[PDB]
Design a protein around this nucleic acid. Structure first.
Lengths: 62, 61, 62
DNA sequence: ACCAGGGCAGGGCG
DNA sequence: GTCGCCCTGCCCTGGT
């Protein structure tokens, strides 16, 4: 539902970075907003769940 | 970034170009500090990273 | 004026270890928080600046 | 009442 | 074992 969602998924899948932090940097948005889009990406199988140390890997092809 | 000149002044005086040093100095987060180091690199104030990961400051103090 | 500064100073001066990492572990604080306090100790003459070889020494007595 | 980003601790690396 | 720095996620300030 976020206007930036499509752009966030593009960034994530092109850059191969699945971090909330990286999205915040690229789109100049806050933690809550970026976290929600990442959670949507997880919910939609674009991005992995995080492992114990918080890192995720990009599922979707670029 | 409105703090760009301050960051430039900091690195050119200290000769330190770590993201973290700038982040602490300017009381800012990692993302904003990284962005500023990137701007300094694009403006020739500091070098890009070498093999290990360290930058040199090119601008005079 | 970090609340934990005096505590950090007592640990550094007792241990003779002027290290950001040792303070992190001793106090259970983040890297930047510990680094800020080491920097503060440098400016106050409690520890030396970082040497060109990396190292730091404690100046102040225990 | 909103919301970017700075407060926090620390894992993963050279 | 040790070190410092990059970059992370999570929590809550700061602000016109």
């Amino acid at each position: 539902d976020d206007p930036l969602y499509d752009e966030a998924v593009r960034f994530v899948t092109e850059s191969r970075r699945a971090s909330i932090s990286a999205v915040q940097r690229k789109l100049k948005i806050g933690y809550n907003r970026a976290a929600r889009m990442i959670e949507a990406m997880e919910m939609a199988g674009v991005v992995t769940p995080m492992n114990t140390n918080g890192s995720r890997e990009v599922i979707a092809p670029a």
